[PDB]
Amino acid sequence: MREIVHIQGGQCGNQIGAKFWEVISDEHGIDPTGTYHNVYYNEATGGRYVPRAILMDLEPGTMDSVRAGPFGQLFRPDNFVFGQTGAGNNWAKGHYTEGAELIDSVLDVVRKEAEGCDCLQGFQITHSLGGGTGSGMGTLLISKVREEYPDRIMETFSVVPSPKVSDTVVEPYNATLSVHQLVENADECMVIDNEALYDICFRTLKLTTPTYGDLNHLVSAAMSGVTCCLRFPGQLNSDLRKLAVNLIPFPRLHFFMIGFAPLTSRGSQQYRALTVPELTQQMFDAKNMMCAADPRHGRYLTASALFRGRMSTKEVDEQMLNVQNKNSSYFVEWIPNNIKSSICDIPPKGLKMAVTFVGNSTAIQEMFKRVAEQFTAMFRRKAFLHWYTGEGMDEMEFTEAESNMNDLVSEYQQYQDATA
Amino acid sequence: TQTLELNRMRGMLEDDFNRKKASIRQAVKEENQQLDKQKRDLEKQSNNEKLNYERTEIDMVKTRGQKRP
Ligand SMILES: Nc1nc2c(ncn2[C@@H]2O[C@H](COP(=O)(O)OP(=O)(O)O)[C@@H](O)[C@H]2O)c(=O)[nH]1
């Protein structure tokens, strides 16, 4: 019933996907052996449920990783397509020489997943953008499956690299080389970045020693809450496309922001109630979204919000109307009623109300801006170029990719300008 | 005498019809009084139940001390 294929590329994407599959298992109560305790899972003889996913990377070490944590025993070994070298942080390897040596097998097993399925609605991808494996092999797979499956929609939870959190120094090159190819073959590139997650988990929940575990936990929570209005009944149902029509008025303005609510700590949870006024007052803020693009520094072309729990549609819709007629400056005028809601009658495990928010804003261009910024100060000097020019990559790629970045950011800028 | 025998017929029939209608109206008033108790009691039950559940939640939250391995 509107089944979904689950691709995970790169080490980052794979860790996040493991977290997400274990969160889903926590939701539908599937103990870590695949027994009860079809949109996501496939039945295996014996009443077992194997997640309809697929994992890939060029360093088999990550294999052992997904076999370490709990709920790792679920995935099927007949989908574990892996390499030997490891793309080693370079975008050339995982896209022209070694990536193309495994795209064949990964596309074969994807065809095996899809052609067996009958009710396939959309895809979903989780992959970094600076890491060679994730970025390169995932964007090549995206190109392939989207030239082969045109009608269905895509979902690339790309975790963009923010500069204030320094991991490597070749991030901008791979980032731009991916983003130039994302704008065509992928219709919903919902971005996340570790800067915003660090900020949230520091100054919103007072976490002492945050590690990547809880960050991936928050991203998995957001990803589940996105489509939770599909696997469960609700007074006003929604799905991937109902999101993908109210949120993107153009074939290029399809870059989003994520948000989830509510979040508080032990020494602070005795003081807040749980009603849609409070959840609304929390979800539209800046420190409650997962992108390093201050939303109040622009407007929202559009935004959708999927609720989970059971409330009185009047309170939700009146709260939406109120927040839209209050912060009208931070909203755009040429599109009326630029917000959308979706009530779903199932709350998460252990709460009563929860909100998963998505927003197409004219303020994330800034993000791409700064990345392209770095590109300049790393391209005019042609630094670290020979690692690319050695695998058929020519200079036209970088210049045209920066051109397309500039075009995108100017689009969002003029639409911040565009009024009526 | 006949016209009196008939006027008393009219009078008795009307003073029975009106009492019957008033009885119907009083029965409807009683039915509404009864319906009111449902919204008087379900809300009380839900209030007490929310109190119990949220108190248990506060307890379960506060019951997180330190580990000290
Ligand atoms: N929030 C979060 N970020 C991660 C995680 N794992 C890796 N990242 C980031 O992903 C980037 C490297 O991507 P990686 O997959 O290791 O390189 P690749 O294998 O060549 O694609 C780095 O910026 C890491 O910090 C994770 O589990 N959670």
CA of A159 to the centre of ligand 1 (A): 8
Whether A113 maps to a domain, the answer reads yes
Same domain, A333 and A221: no
Whether A205 maps to a domain, the answer reads yes
* Spatial separation of the C-alpha atoms in residues A311 and A1, rounded to whole Å: 27
Task: Tell me whether residue A156 is exposed, middle or buried, using C-beta atoms within 10 angstroms of its C-beta: 0 to 12, 13 to 18, 19 or more.
Answer: buried
Same domain, A183 and A322: no
The one-letter code for the residue type at A35 is T
* Spatial separation of the C-alpha atoms in residues A371 and A113, rounded to whole Å: 36
State how far residue B37 is from chain A, nearest Cα, in angstroms. 23
Structural domain for A13, as ranges: 3-246
Residue of A7, A8, A11 best suited for mutating to test ligand 1, as the one with most atoms within 8 Å of CB: A11
Same domain, A132 and A221: yes
Q: How many residues does chain B have?
A: 69
Last residue of a domain, one of A364, A391, A410: A364
* Spatial separation of the C-alpha atoms in residues B33 and B25, rounded to whole Å: 12
Contact list in B for residue A266 (CB cut-off 8 A) is 61-62, 64
Chain mean position to CA A50: 22
Whether A76 maps to a domain, the answer reads yes
The one-letter code for the residue type at A375 is F
* Spatial separation of the C-alpha atoms in residues A237 and A345, rounded to whole Å: 9
* Spatial separation of the C-alpha atoms in residues A182 and A191, rounded to whole Å: 12
Q: Breaks in chain A follow which residues, C to N over 2.5 Å?
A: 37
Give the list of residues 6+ apart from residue A178 with CB closer than 8 angstroms, or none: A91, A129, A135, A136, A139, A158
Annotate chain A with three-state secondary structure: CCEECEEEEHHHHHHHHHHHHHHHHHHCCECCCCCECCCCEEEECCCEEEECEEEEECCCHHHHHHCCCCCCCCCCHHHCEECCCCCCCCCCHHHHHCHHHHHHHHHHHHHHHHHHCCCEEECCEEEECCCHHHHHHHHHHHHHHHHHCCCCECCEEEECCCCCCCCCCCHHHHHHHHHHHHHHHCCCEECECHHHHHHHHHHCCCCCCCCHHHHHHHHHHHHHHHHCCCCCCCCCCCCHHHHHHHCCCCCCCCEECEEEECCCCHHHCCCCCCCHHHHHHHHCCCCCECCCCCHHHCCEEEEEEEEEECCCHHHHHHHHHHHHHHCCCCECCCCCCCEEEEEECCCCCCCCEEEEEEEEECCCHHHHHHHHHHHHHHHCCCCCCHHHHCCCCCCHHHHHHHHHHHHHHHHHHHHHHCCC
Give me the torsion for CA of A364, A369, A372, A374, rounded to 10°: -110
Last residue of a domain, one of A364, A384, A408: A364
Experimental method: cryo-EM
Whether A395 maps to a domain, the answer reads no
Same domain, A340 and A226: no
Residue of A56, A140, A158, A159 best suited for mutating to test ligand 1, as the one with most atoms within 8 Å of CB: A159
Looking at residue A153, which CATH number applies to its domain? 3.40.50.1440
Closest Cα to atom 5 of ligand 1: A12
Whether A186 maps to a domain, the answer reads yes
A23 and A69 Cβ atoms separated by less than 8 Å: no
CA neighbours within 13 Å on the CB side: how many for A187?
Answer: 23
Residue that has been written with the tokens 């971005």 in this structure: A191
Q: Which residue of A has its CA nearest to B60?
A: A266
Task: Tell me whether residue A362 is exposed, middle or buried, using C-beta atoms within 10 angstroms of its C-beta: 0 to 12, 13 to 18, 19 or more.
Answer: buried
A352 and A260 Cβ atoms separated by less than 8 Å: no
Whether the ω angle into residue A51 lies within 30 degrees of 0, i.e. cis, is: no
Same domain, A227 and A320: no
| Strand-pair partners of A57 | A82
Same domain, A335 and A237: no
Whether A384 maps to a domain, the answer reads no
Binary contact (B64, A266; C-beta < 8 A): yes
Resolution (A): 4.2
- List pocket residues of ligand 1, CB cut-off 6 Å: A 10-12, 15-16, 57, 87, 89, 128, 130-134, 159, 161, 167, 194, 197, 212, 215-216
CA of A84 to the centre of ligand 1 (A): 18
Binary contact (A270, B64; C-beta < 8 A): no
Looking at residue A264, which CATH number applies to its domain? 3.30.1330.20
* Spatial separation of the C-alpha atoms in residues A223 and A21, rounded to whole Å: 10
Q: How many domains does chain A have?
A: 2
State how far residue A114 is from chain B, nearest Cα, in angstroms. 44
Last residue of a domain, one of A319, A335, A364: A364
Same domain, A66 and A142: yes
Strands A41-44 vs A125-128: parallel, antiparallel or unpaired: unpaired
* Spatial separation of the C-alpha atoms in residues A155 and A284, rounded to whole Å: 23
Same domain, A198 and A274: no
Whether A390 maps to a domain, the answer reads no
Inter-CA distances, A182 with A32, A125, A248, A279, B43, Å: 35, 12, 15, 33, 53
Same domain, A44 and A169: yes
The one-letter code for the residue type at A222 is A
Whether A401 maps to a domain, the answer reads no
CA of A52 to the centre of ligand 1 (A): 23
Residue that has been written with the tokens 């915003």 in this structure: A196
Same domain, A80 and A157: yes
Task: Tell me if A327 is assigned to a ligand binding site.
Answer: no
Contact list in A for residue B63 (CB cut-off 8 A) is none
Same domain, A127 and A191: yes
Could you count the other beta carbons within 10 Å of the beta carbon of residue A246?
19
Structure token digits, residue A333: 């005028």
* Spatial separation of the C-alpha atoms in residues A349 and A108, rounded to whole Å: 37
Task: Tell me if A133 is assigned to a ligand binding site.
Answer: yes
Chain mean position to CA A110: 20
Same domain, A94 and A77: yes
Chain B interface with A: residues with Cβ < 8 Å: 58, 61-62, 64
